[PDB]
A paper describes a structure:
The mixed-lineage leukemia (MLL) family of histone methyltransferases (HMTs) catalyzes the deposition of histone H3 lysine 4 methylation (H3K4me) associated with active transcription. We and others have previously shown that these core components are essential for MLL1 catalytic activity on histone H327–29. Compared to the well-studied WDR5, RbBP5, and ASH2LSPRY proteins, the function of DPY30 and the extended intrinsically disordered regions (IDRs) of ASH2L in the MLL1 complex remains a mystery. By combined NMR, SAXS, cryo-EM and biochemical approaches, we find that DPY30 functions through the extended IDRs of ASH2L to restrict the rotational dynamics of the MLL1 complex on the NCP, thereby promoting H3K4 methylation at higher methylation states.
To understand the molecular mechanism by which DPY30 regulates MLL1 activity on the NCP, we determined the single-particle cryo-EM structure of the human recombinant MLL1RWSA complex (4-MLL1), containing four of the five core proteins, i.e. RbBP5 (aa 1–538); WDR5 (aa 22–334); MLL1SET (aa 3762–3969); and ASH2LΔSDI (aa 1–504), bound to the NCP (4-MLL1-NCP). After several rounds of heterogeneous refinement using cryoSPARC57, we isolated four different subclasses of 4-MLL1-NCP (Class01, 02, 03, and 05). In the end, we obtained three different subclasses of 4-MLL1-NCP structures (Class 01, 02, and 05). With RbBP5 anchoring near SHL 1.5, ASH2L binding sites varied from SHL 7 to SHL 4.5 among different subclasses. Furthermore, local ASH2L binding dynamics on the NCP also increased significantly in the absence of DPY30, as demonstrated by extremely low or complete loss of ASH2L IDR density in a significant subset of the structures. The cryo-EM structure of the 4-MLL1-NCP complex shows significant rotational dynamics on the NCP as compared to the 5-MLL1-NCP, 5-MLL3-NCP or ySET1-NCP complexes. We envision that increased rotational dynamics of the 4-MLL1 complex or local ASH2L dynamics reduces the probability of the MLL1 SET domain positioning near nucleosome dyad. In this scenario, the MLL1SET domain has to go through multiple spatial arrangements to optimally engage both H3 substrates in the NCP, which negatively affect MLL1 processivity.
Numbering used by the authors:
A (entry chain D): 279 to 400, 440 to 534
B (entry chain A): 18 to 323
C (entry chain K), L (entry chain G): 37 to 134
D (entry chain B): 32 to 209, 215 to 334
E (entry chain C): 3814 to 3945, 3954 to 3969
F (entry chain J), I (entry chain N): 29 to 121
G (entry chain L), K (entry chain H): 20 to 101
H (entry chain I), J (entry chain M): 12 to 118
Write the structure that this text describes.
DNA sequence: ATCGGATGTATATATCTGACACGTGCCTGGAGACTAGGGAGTAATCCCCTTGGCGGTTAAAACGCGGGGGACAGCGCGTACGTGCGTTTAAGCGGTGCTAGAGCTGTCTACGACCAATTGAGCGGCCTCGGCACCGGGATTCTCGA
DNA sequence: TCGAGAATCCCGGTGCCGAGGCCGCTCAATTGGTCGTAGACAGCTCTAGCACCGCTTAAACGCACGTACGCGCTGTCCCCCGCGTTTTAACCGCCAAGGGGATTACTCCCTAGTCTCCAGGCACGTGTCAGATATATACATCCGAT
């Protein structure tokens, strides 16, 4: 089974660089040399959802970056060095993608509890977008052009950056949408999905036959 | 015909695979690896405190098996001189012999016990069978390819086993002519072909072709390819060996410190080499690819070229 | 007809179950009375912990089964299955208890 | 790695080819088929030397003499037939196999023959009198391949029952017993044994160890007797046919495919490696009926 | 040592480090021929690197041919299918107490599934790992009685 | 009255080795007593040695030496390694 | 309350039970009392030494830690009592 | 004023500070090596690991989750090194390991 | 190097008990080693009991108790009486 | 103020100053009692008296003035309580006290 | 200078001399080498532990006080060497 | 006619004189060579005090005569005057040396 | 050597539970930070013990050599010991009740700690000489064949 | 069993160096303040021990009895004791080199000691299942007839 060593949907230790340190007191992430990247346990494939990053330490030589990244994302790169990652630089609010920085954004603060909203549909993915909030206040749209493939929330560290990801039920400035889902919800959704994946693979190899309902869901 | 002053206490020597180096044991228990071309010592190995009486090169030449008089056998890398492995037994070892086609394996002829074939990878051992169960003195040797094991007892009985299964593939007892047995002093083989020789207590060397023993089967009457002796002096043979090609055979008369040289096909005596009448002949070897012959007598080595 | 197991056999099974069991094999109160009797020799009217006396009896019985064990061993070297007092004495002797 | 290129394509057997063998001198190529015909061809130019007939049923195997003077032909007529390669004369016709004879091989001294048949018994035969000297209930299934060791002291036998049995020659003693094995043969040094099993797998075993040393896959062989040869004239390789119309060549040591000779349209049923040159004859089945010479530079 | 250098060393020594023999576990299996240290590279499960979406089309294909599937999941996106093209690693039995363990490594961008040694493995030992109702005969005292 | 122990630590290492396997309080106190005894063993031995060295300070080298004195062969070897690890991990602090 | 003769309070069945635990098959009678003596002698030390501790402890009750330190000093240390 | 215990600094369990205070109050040496508590506690961690591991081995060998002192006795009697370490040591509720002598068996 | 011993006091108490007797220096060294042995014994036992009593002060009561723990019967009794008389004498002034 | 040794006021022979020095240097307690070195030194003097007396007995029995370790070993194995105290102790040039077994005798 | 086989350097006359000192009349052969082994085993510990002391002593020569503290730790203390 | 004392008698007197004597009964140099041989096993080229090695040999021989003594005693309990290896082994067993 | 019967023992089951894992609020030892001294570490020097070798001796070890002495195997018997079953008996549960004595806190004080000033008891070193060790020789006593 | 012979005890005499005595030469012992504090002691709890007593019963003691190991005796083998001889290397005495051991003098890194603050540990409640216990059952194994 794919049983995950986690009480809640957290930053997966399986997908960190060897130069990436964690503190589960706040599940903060920190590094020592250059930039690195860590990701959460879950991964979005459809729908709209939302999470946050809480910053606990940002010296001048300390610039974290926060955003999303698809697989193929080299976890040693600073979360936006490739075309499959879209993040924000935590010195001034600047959208970073393909290592390109764009000032189509607001300003970032040292003690920012930043909210991250993102909607992928069920060659840009149709009607997919990313919205950035500062303490719930809309910092604005970050990326409308979103490539296919599953994405996951990710954090890049510079030298000694202290930031942490956080789910919805303990939120501070949450949106009141009835459609968006917190980190924990999509987390257990993907966990149950991979449980069924194990089920179906052991079925395939073990018993002849397979069968699934009217495709739409 | 040419000696070497740089080595002392020469006791036993052994040519490498190509006849370029010579590892000689000394009474101090040291290996002196001496080179033919540079005509100098190539290496000195602190093998044992006990003199070495059995020495064999590896096929690649990078390993040498040595046997002390302390019943201590040890493998040494020729480049480094380290004791790769070391073992000890009862019934002090009479001889060691690398397997010619598998240097991991090595046969050992002890004094009172049966010869045992060990491996270096695994410190295991296979005790080879004994026909009469009471020989207490059986010499043994691999053939040219290491496919069979020839074991000769003090009672003239000769067993040919297969090296892998130790199964009796041939057998026969040599005769003193009339009806008696003779102590098999030694079994030697040719590095080329299939002719081999037996030195026996009757002072008569018996040359055979192993194929004829294999086709003779168990408990047969195989005749020798040749019978060789000093019909004039009736001299024992401390050590004998073929030529490198296998068409010339030499015997060492330790009784009078001489060297007899016969042929294989005809068997007529090629020649005789006379050493120092005061020297006690101990060891004899032939250059594998040269008409050069190494002799060890009274701790001194002599060289005989042609 | 009445059945009786051969000698030792029942005792053999007793050995087996005792190596199987682990609890004490001495009645508590007699041991305690003995301990207090020994105590009054050195000083009278001294109190004790039940834990203390449990420790006493456990440690004793341990020493005792050890003595029985190695005396059994010695009797093996004595080639007998019956035990002899001299075995115990000399065992203590080797145990430096003399 | 080899670079075998097609040089000569050979054909003419009216039915499915069952075996092609290079003459030990490398002068001729003998091709047997189920058409009761054998075909000698030039080994360097693809020149059809001649056709030798006389067998009454399909031919399942043919083997050269060591002096390149005789050829033993094992046919489905339950008979062997020893032929002078120079005259094409049926010097001998070996009778005694109670069923289809599938394989045949000479001793290293060319004076003796081993033969496997459908009768699941291996027969051991004289050459100069053509007389059966031994007969062994070797396997519980029809024999696929029999072969001599380097000297003629050991006979290896494979059969459809999946057993690879080494037998003593002088006594018929079943010395050793190591998936339906369709081919088997000794190593050139007599130290190893190459055996093909009908699961797309080739296995090289140590004889002194009795254990498989190397395995070779990637080809396709599950029904037919696909031959395997040691490529030695250049690099050390293992060449074989496959049911995918390919001619597979693996590295001998690394067991990795070093070449894939394509150009055959049917299952490459038989293979032969030149004794002296880097030449490989690959004969395919009836949907191809062609034999192709391949020459590389290493 | 570098994962590329270690992988080159592993691919150089694999042919002489391990063998396949008759197995008391089941049929034929992988045995150790030279004492293998803990954590070192035992063997690559080499084969055809494919994407996951093509697994089923292959599997059903083999299901149509009666040929057993030799596939190992590299990750959620790639699979080494060794059914038609593979190596000796297709003969590694399983044990509830494995002296080996599978790990995915990245060499020059491509992923390799290498069985490493959970412990110091000695010569002659049969190699087994955790594949993660089929009865099991691994012989371990902790055996789950079933892989599943 | 506060009575110190190591049941917390023995339970910790139990889980670290066997999260499944439980523990009895009797055997727990057995473990505690045992570790106390062996700690006094090593303490007395190291102090004795240092007194032989006449060195009023007690350092880790003493500990290594004296446990080597204490442990039967390979244990000590294994032991000292982790010990070294420890101090390395602590010297690298 | 003056005590006495609890040594024979040790039952021969108890002694043979301990012996069977020690893995003994055949036993003689002469052992038991002898055994008992040893027993006495053995405990003869510890309690005294124990109360010796209690001596310095200036207390009227005797504790386990007493016999703990005794067996320690007697080189027969025991676990499970602090 | 960030806090981090020396045990975490060694990534271990046994309390370096507590054992340091203990040896200090133990009156063995005037000054101490600061790493000596770390080292010794690591050794204790190791040996405790082995003994409890063997104990649990016997325990689940007896389908016993919670380990009994009998498991402890069996463990300490099986291993040569640990038995040698604790030869003259006794264990509460220990009992004796299974041992029957040769001649004890009837023929 | 200034090395300390007791052989002078050995000779003293010898003359106190046997004035007309000689000793082997070997035997003197043996006796001195014995002195050291009994001293370390009594000191360790006293420190250990004080630890059991959680005492940081080792006094004559500890001395007597530890001797009684160590010496048997009349040996212990006479030693206790002698130490008592001596400490009484010293405390008398 | 004339300085007399404390052992004089104790009326003893062994240097109680050296005693208390070894005591403080022995790391046994934080502070040694005043009369404790006195008491223990008195014990030491008494036991030394006992052993030396036994030794002189043995030596004069052997018609010997100079007392060799053999005398002392014999006295050791002659005093049961002292032996018990020292049976765990080995003795250089001790040899073995003459002990003859019964069945060893001839007939 | 590599040493070896000094164990048999222990003469059977020496062994029987020690035995006679121990008060032994009749002896078998099987003992001596066995004896020797034990001897070895016995010293097997102390020297190591001794040099262990010398280990911490950071010295190349080995002293008596080493074996003194060993036999002490081995509970077999000896007198007459400081 | 030649005279020969009855068995043991000479050895008996040897016992008597050895309990009479006190010096060593082992040749110094062989013992020393053995010690150095043992030493090189743990570390090579280590020096020693003559006093140190004298202590080694004395303490050894003491342990050895003690072993011979109590094994003699055990053999008494074995009712034999000849010694048996098992006596020594089991003595060590009681001596906790197993 | 087998089978049948007796009996004893490993197993599944059910439930009871009380140890036991678990969580708390509160406490203080542990961490963190800062200061001093001085134990420890290093280095150059001296010594001097050790390790090495060399030659002569013989007491000692090696080895052999009967051969009586006992290890040992076996063999008879018998007494002492397992055993199963009787019997009676304290052992254990348990629960009660009193308090003597551990076991805790709060003084206050004598008591080493410690340092400083002083030095003579003691220790390294140097004669020296006498019990003691060795030796040779005479007398005594055990022992093995009458 | 009374001698012969052999190992030993003892006696006188020889020569020696360790045991001992004495001599310079301190540093460690004494003396005397002085101080913070270990514990001595008083004075409280409370609880664990100590004894009481009843009820149940598994347990203990003794019996009878088979029986089988302990023991005692015989004859054998071999083997280890005793003595003789031959070989050797331990010893012993002397020499010599150096390499380590011990020493002293600097030097300063680390630890003791202090003070602050709090957070992990600890006492303390709290459900709760590992396993204790009992029961019927199925399997293993002994013991005696065949």
């Amino acid at each position: 089974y794919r049983a995950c060593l986690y009480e809640r949907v957290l930053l997966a230790l399986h997908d960190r660089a060897p130069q990436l340190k964690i503190s589960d007191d706040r599940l903060t992430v920190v590094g020592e040399k250059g930039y690195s990247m860590v990701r959460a346990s879950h991964g979005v494939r459809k729908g709209a959802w939302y999470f946050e990053i809480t910053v606990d330490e940002m010296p001048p030589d300390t610039a974290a970056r926060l955003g999303w990244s698809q697989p193929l994302g080299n976890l040693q790169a600073p979360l936006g060095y490739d075309k499959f990652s879209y993040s924000w630089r935590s010195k001034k609010g600047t959208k970073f993608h393909q290592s390109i920085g764009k000032h189509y954004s607001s300003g970032y603060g040292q003690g920012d509890v930043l909210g991250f909203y993102i909607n992928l549909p069920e060659k840009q993915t149709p009607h997919s977008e990313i919205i950035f909030y500062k303490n719930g206040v809309n910092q604005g749209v970050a990326y409308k052009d979103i490539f296919e493939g599953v994405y996951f929330p990710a954090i890049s560290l510079y030298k000694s950056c202290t930031v942490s990801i956080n789910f919805g039920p303990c939120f501070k400035y949450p949106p009141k949408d009835l459609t968006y889902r917190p980190m924990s919800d999509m987390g257990w959704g993907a966990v149950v999905e991979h449980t069924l994946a194990d089920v179906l693979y052991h079925v395939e190899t073990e018993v002849d036959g397979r069968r699934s309902p009217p495709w739409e869901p | 015909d040419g000696t070497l002053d740089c080595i002392s206490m020469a006791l036993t020597c052994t040519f490498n695979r190509w006849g370029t180096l010579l590892a000689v044991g000394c009474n101090d228990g040291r290996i002196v690896i001496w080179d033919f071309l540079t005509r100098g010592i190539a290496k000195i190995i602190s093998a044992h405190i006990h003199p070495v009486c059995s020495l064999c090169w590896s096929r690649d030449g990078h390993k040498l098996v040595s046997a002390s008089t302390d019943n201590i056998v040890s493998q040494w890398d020729v480049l480094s001189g380290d004791c790769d492995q070391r073992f000890r037994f009862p019934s002090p070892i009479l001889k060691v012999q690398y397997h010619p086609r598998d240097q991991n394996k090595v046969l050992v002829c002890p004094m009172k016990s049966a010869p045992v074939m060990l491996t270096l990878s695994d410190s295991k051992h296979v005790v080879l069978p004994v026909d009469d169960d009471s020989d207490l003195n059986v010499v043994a040797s691999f053939d040219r390819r290491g496919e069979y094991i020839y074991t000769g007892n003090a009672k003239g009985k000769i067993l040919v086993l297969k090296t892998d299964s130790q199964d009796l593939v041939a057998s026969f007892r040599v005769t003193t002519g009339t009806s008696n047995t003779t102590a098999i002093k030694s079994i030697e083989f040719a590095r080329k072909g299939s002719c081999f020789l037996i030195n026996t207590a009757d002072r008569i060397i018996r040359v055979y072709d192993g194929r004829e023993i294999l086709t003779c089967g168990r408990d047969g009457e195989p005749e020798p390819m040749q019978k060789l002796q000093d019909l004039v002096n009736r001299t024992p043979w401390k050590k004998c060996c073929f030529s490198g090609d296998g068409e010339y055979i030499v015997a060492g008369s330790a009784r009078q410190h001489a060297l007899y040289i016969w042929e294989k096909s005809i068997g007529n005596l090629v020649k005789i080499l006379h050493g120092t009448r005061g020297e006690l002949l101990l060891d004899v070897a032939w250059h594998p690819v040269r008409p050069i012959i190494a002799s060890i007598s009274s701790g001194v080595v002599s060289i005989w070229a042609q | 007809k009445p059945h009786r197991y051969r000698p030792g056999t029942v005792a053999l099974r007793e050995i087996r179950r005792y190596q199987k069991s682990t609890e004490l094999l001495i009645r508590k109160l007699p041991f305690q009375r003995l301990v207090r009797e020994i105590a009054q020799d050195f000083k009278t009217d001294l109190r004790f912990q039940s834990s203390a006396v449990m420790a006493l009896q456990e440690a004793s019985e341990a020493y005792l089964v050890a003595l029985f064990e190695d005396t059994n061993l010695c009797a093996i070297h004595a080639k007998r299955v019956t035990i002899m007092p001299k075995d115990i004495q000399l065992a203590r002797r080797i145990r430096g208890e003399r | 790695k080899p670079n075998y290129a097609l040089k000569f394509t050979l054909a003419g057997h009216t039915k499915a080819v069952s075996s092609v063998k290079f003459s030990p001198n490398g002068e001729w190529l003998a091709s047997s088929s189920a058409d009761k015909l054998i075909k000698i061809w030039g080994a360097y130019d693809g020149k059809f030397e001649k056709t030798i007939s006389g067998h009454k049923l399909g031919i399942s195997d043919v083997a050269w003499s060591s002096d390149s003077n005789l050829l033993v032909s094992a046919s489905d007529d339950k008979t062997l037939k020893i032929w002078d390669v120079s005259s094409g004369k049926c010097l001998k016709t070996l009778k005694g196999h109670s069923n289809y004879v599938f394989c045949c091989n000479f001793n290293p001294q060319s004076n003796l023959i081993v033969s496997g048949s459908f009768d699941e018994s291996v027969r051991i035969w004289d050459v100069k009198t053509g007389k059966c000297l031994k007969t062994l209930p070797a396997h519980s299934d029809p024999v696929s391949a029999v072969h001599f060791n380097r000297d003629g002291s050991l006979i290896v036998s494979s059969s459809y029952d999946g057993l690879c049995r080494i037998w003593d020659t002088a006594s018929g003693q079943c010395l050793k017993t190591l998936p339906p094995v369709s081919f088997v043969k000794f190593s050139p040094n007599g130290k190893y044994i190459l055996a093909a099993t009908l699961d797309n797998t080739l296995k090289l075993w140590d004889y002194s160890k009795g254990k498989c040393l190397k395995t070779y896959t990637g080809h396709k062989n599950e029904k037919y007797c696909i031959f395997a040869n040691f490529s030695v004239t250049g690099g050390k390789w293992i060449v074989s046919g496959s049911e995918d119309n390919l001619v597979y060549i693996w590295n001998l040591q690394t067991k990795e495919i070093v070449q894939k000779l394509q150009g055959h349209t049917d299952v490459v049923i038989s293979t032969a490696c030149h004794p002296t040159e880097n030449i490989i004859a690959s004969a395919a089945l009836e949907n191809d009926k062609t034999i192709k010479l391949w020459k590389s530079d290493c | 040592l570098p994962m590329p250098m270690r992988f080159r060393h592993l691919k150089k020594t694999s042919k002489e480090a391990v063998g396949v023999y008759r197995s008391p576990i089941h049929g034929r299996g992988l045995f150790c021929k030279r004492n293998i240290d803990a954590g070192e590279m035992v063997i690559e499960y080499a084969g055809i690197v494919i994407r996951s979406i093509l697994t089923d089309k292959r599997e059903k294909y083999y299901d149509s041919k009666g040929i057993g599937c030799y596939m190992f999941r590299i990750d959620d996106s790639e699979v080494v299918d060794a059914t038609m093209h593979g190596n000796a690693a297709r003969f590694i039995n399983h044990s509830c107490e494995p002296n080996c363990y599978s790990r995915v490594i990245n060499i020059d961008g491509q992923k390799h599934i290498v069985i490493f040694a959970m412990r110091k493995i000695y010569r002659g030992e049969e190699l087994t790992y955790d594949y993660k109702k089929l009865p099991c005969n691994c012989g371990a005292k902790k055996c789950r009685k079933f892989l599943n | 009255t506060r009575k110190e122990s190591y049941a917390i630590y023995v339970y910790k290492v139990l889980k670290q080795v066997h999260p499944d396997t439980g523990i009895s309080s009797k055997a727990m106190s057995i473990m505690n007593s045992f570790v106390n005894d062996v700690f006094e063993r090593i303490a007395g031995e190291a102090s004795r040695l240092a007194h032989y060295n006449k060195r009023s300070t007690i350092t880790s080298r003493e500990i290594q030496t004296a446990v080597r004195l204490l442990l039967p062969g390979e244990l000590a070897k294994h032991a000292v390694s982790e010990g070294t690890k420890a101090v390395t991990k602590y010297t690298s602090a | 309350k003056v005590l006495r003769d609890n040594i024979q309070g040790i039952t021969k069945p108890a002694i043979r039970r301990l012996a069977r635990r020690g893995g003994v098959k055949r036993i003689s009678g002469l052992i038991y009392e002898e055994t008992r003596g040893v027993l006495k002698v053995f405990l003869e030390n510890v309690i005294r030494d124990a109360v010796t501790y209690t001596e310095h402890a200036k207390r009227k009750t005797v504790t386990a830690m007493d016999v703990v330190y005794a067996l320690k000093r007697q080189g027969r240390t025991l676990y499970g009592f602090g | 004023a960030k806090a981090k215990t020396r045990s975490s600094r060694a990534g271990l369990q046994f309390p370096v500070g507590r054992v340091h205070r203990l040896l200090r109050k133990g009156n063995y040496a005037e000054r101490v090596g600061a790493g000596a508590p770390v080292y010794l506690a690591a050794v204790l961690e190791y040996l405790t690991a082995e003994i409890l591991e063997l104990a649990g081995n016997a325990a689940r060998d007896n389908k016993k989750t919670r380990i009994i002192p009998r498991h402890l006795q069996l463990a300490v009697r099986n291993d040569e090194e640990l038995n040698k370490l604790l030869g003259r040591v006794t264990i509460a509720q220990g009992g004796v390991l299974p041992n029957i002598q040769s001649v004890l068996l009837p023929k």
